[PDB]
Design an enzyme around this catalytic site. Structure first.
Site, PDB file in Angstrom:
ATOM      1  N   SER A   1       0.764  -1.177  -0.009  1.00  0.00           N
ATOM      2  CA  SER A   1       0.204   0.071  -0.114  1.00  0.00           C
ATOM      3  C   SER A   1       1.110   1.337   0.182  1.00  0.00           C
ATOM      4  O   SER A   1       1.520   1.675  -0.896  1.00  0.00           O
ATOM      5  CB  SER A   1      -0.921  -0.139   1.380  1.00  0.00           C
ATOM      6  OG  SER A   1      -1.905   0.905   0.812  1.00  0.00           O
TER       7      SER A   1
ATOM      8  N   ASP B   1     -10.434  -3.005  -4.855  1.00  0.00           N
ATOM      9  CA  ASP B   1      -9.630  -2.022  -4.288  1.00  0.00           C
ATOM     10  C   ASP B   1      -9.786  -0.747  -4.944  1.00  0.00           C
ATOM     11  O   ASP B   1      -9.450  -0.734  -6.221  1.00  0.00           O
ATOM     12  CB  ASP B   1      -8.201  -2.648  -4.019  1.00  0.00           C
ATOM     13  CG  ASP B   1      -7.389  -1.933  -3.422  1.00  0.00           C
ATOM     14  OD1 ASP B   1      -7.465  -0.634  -2.667  1.00  0.00           O
ATOM     15  OD2 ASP B   1      -6.210  -2.391  -3.093  1.00  0.00           O
TER      16      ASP B   1
ATOM     17  N   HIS C   1      -8.353  -4.777  -0.696  1.00  0.00           N
ATOM     18  CA  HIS C   1      -7.229  -4.039  -0.162  1.00  0.00           C
ATOM     19  C   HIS C   1      -6.865  -5.001   0.978  1.00  0.00           C
ATOM     20  O   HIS C   1      -7.523  -5.277   1.846  1.00  0.00           O
ATOM     21  CB  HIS C   1      -7.506  -2.756   0.169  1.00  0.00           C
ATOM     22  CG  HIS C   1      -6.268  -2.017   0.338  1.00  0.00           C
ATOM     23  ND1 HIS C   1      -5.128  -1.482  -0.524  1.00  0.00           N
ATOM     24  CD2 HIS C   1      -5.820  -1.437   1.512  1.00  0.00           C
ATOM     25  CE1 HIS C   1      -4.392  -0.867  -0.003  1.00  0.00           C
ATOM     26  NE2 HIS C   1      -4.801  -0.753   1.454  1.00  0.00           N
TER      27      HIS C   1
END
Ligand SMILES: O=[N+]([O-])c1ccc(O)cc1
Lengths: 315, 314
Positions: free
Chosen positions: A157, A254, A284
């Site tokens: 991320s 996501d 995610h």
């Protein structure tokens, strides 16, 4: 969205818990939420752990956790790891199982950068800490008992944002040499109106208002967000060409999916060897969250990343 | 957007009209792909036995059995169903791919050289495929394999065959299957869906080619919605209880959407499904030698190999 059943069950549990949205909390509150969510009992690979500090980076010191397959005293290849969770959250606890799996599957030392989080630290503190630790590892191979010619960087991320930016910084500064880079569902842009942001604005798990909040914690008000050290989707061909082979893994459901895959295309068209894989049916954070650790996507993506890194670092 | 080496391969085909493979006779098409799959390429070392099993709806099915070179152990076993539109494909066209799977999975692999179309029609190949899978399960001492660790796998129409063999095994009470692997499978015959429309004119695989292949495969007038033809139409009860599945699709492929939709159906029926799309690549990308060094090909073969190794030796 059609989610894998266990993953759907998690999402259902969430909307039934009625909690407040993460971005309504203080940084310290948000940190504790994720820490508690990841505090459950779960089996983990056996590792040796050393917590310490390297006297490098723009603050003068950077905390790091060094992890190695338990009992292994050989000179190993090394992974420098940048964790995610919105710049605000995340720690050695939240990402423990994931980074242990990478260390053991890659048979590598792994240096977890416990960078200064936001909003107490804004851009560019963390990326410069990240870069400085990567350089430190490359320059202190005897002190760490690693092989600095087999050095990989990886992150999830915002940690994938840092992976891409460390690669770019290393290009601009002439080093260090990087053998390979792994990016789990990276943040690469700040276009909150693209296809996947629109399709998944309300979730699952990660939402568009949360991304707006996270970016605002990370960045000073009014800064130009198109700088490639902030949104590496805007990196030039010359900044991307010559970078290490990359593995980019996205989640079908996501908000970040499209920018991660668009970034992989940019890398590939600059001549970098890019392995890019979308996992359907997941969300995610699917290689970090303990609650998803037994889902097929989590197992497959961690296995793919571990094997990609083992081949890169030992082939 | 295609990976650069893949794009270069496609550009080498710009005078071929698709390729317009459907303009050729079956024998000419076979030779085109056989030639394309000749050249120079590294492959893992295997021991080979060509033979025929006295099974299937015609009484005989040709098979090639391979094993990691020099390995005398009782190994787990993969039964493999090759693709190339029912018309094409042979032990040569899929040689590198199945060698990788055999050595990476550390498994015997039984390559079913089923009767190709249009000489044979549905349901000859799927019944041959099922008969061989059963035969392998029931002749493990002759084949020196462990029938409790049996996987099935295939690419494209071979992925269609994998799904159908899984279904036939459910219907007929066996054999037990440990795992199934489907590379960009044919699962539907809806030529107007999203990826069919987006990639109708290529790259590599075209809508007219699929129309032609389907017409070579099926007798005129049959209802294509039967699940033994289009397994996307299988019921939850036909899918439930099947073996864990790895489904791998290509981003730039008319068949992408039906492969991913079939993975969803399996998953909602309670099957443990690992489903991954490889961006930047095309149909046939784990078979084609010219793409063997592209990142997508290397990644998908390494993923399938490890998935099979874990399923069969874990
Ligand atoms: O050899 N060819 O031109 C081909 C072969 C197979 C295919 O799906 C498309 C084109």
């Amino acid at each position: 969205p059609v989610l894998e059943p266990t993953t759907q069950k998690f999402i259902n549990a969430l909307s039934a818990s009625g909690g407040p949205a993460i971005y309504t909390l203080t940084p310290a509150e948000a940190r504790d939420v994720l820490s508690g969510a990841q505090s459950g009992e779960i089996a983990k690979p056996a590792v040796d752990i050393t917590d310490t500090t390297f006297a490098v980076g723009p603050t003068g010191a950077t905390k790091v956790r060094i992890i190695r397959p338990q009992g292994n005293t050989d000179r190993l290849p090394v992974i420098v790891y940048f964790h995610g969770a919105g710049w605000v959250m995340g720690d050695t606890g939240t990402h423990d199982r994931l980074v242990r799996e990478l260390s053991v599957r890659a048979n590598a030392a792994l240096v977890f950068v416990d960078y200064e989080r936001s909003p107490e630290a804004r851009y560019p503190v963390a990326i410069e800490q990240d870069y400085a630790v990567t350089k430190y590892v490359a320059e202190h191979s005897e002190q760490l008992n690693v092989d600095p010619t087999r050095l990989a960087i990886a992150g999830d991320s915002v940690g994938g944002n840092m992976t891409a930016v460390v690669s770019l910084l290393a290009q601009e500064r002439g080093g260090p040499d990087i053998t390979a880079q792994v990016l789990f569902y990276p943040v690469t842009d700040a276009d909150f109106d693209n296809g996947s942001y629109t399709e998944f604005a309300n979730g699952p798990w990660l939402t568009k208002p949360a991304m707006d909040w996270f970016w605002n914690q990370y960045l000073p008000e009014g800064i130009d967000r198109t700088d490639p050290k902030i949104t590496p989707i805007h990196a030039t061909s010359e900044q991307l060409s010559g970078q290490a082979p990359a593995l980019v893994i996205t989640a079908e459901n996501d908000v970040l999916r499209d920018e991660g895959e668009a970034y992989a295309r940019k890398l590939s068209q600059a001549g970098v060897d890019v392995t890019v894989t979308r996992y359907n049916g997941t969300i995610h954070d699917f290689v970090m969250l303990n609650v998803l650790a037994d889902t097929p996507a989590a197992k497959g993506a961690i296995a793919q990343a571990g094997q990609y890194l083992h081949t890169a670092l030992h082939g």
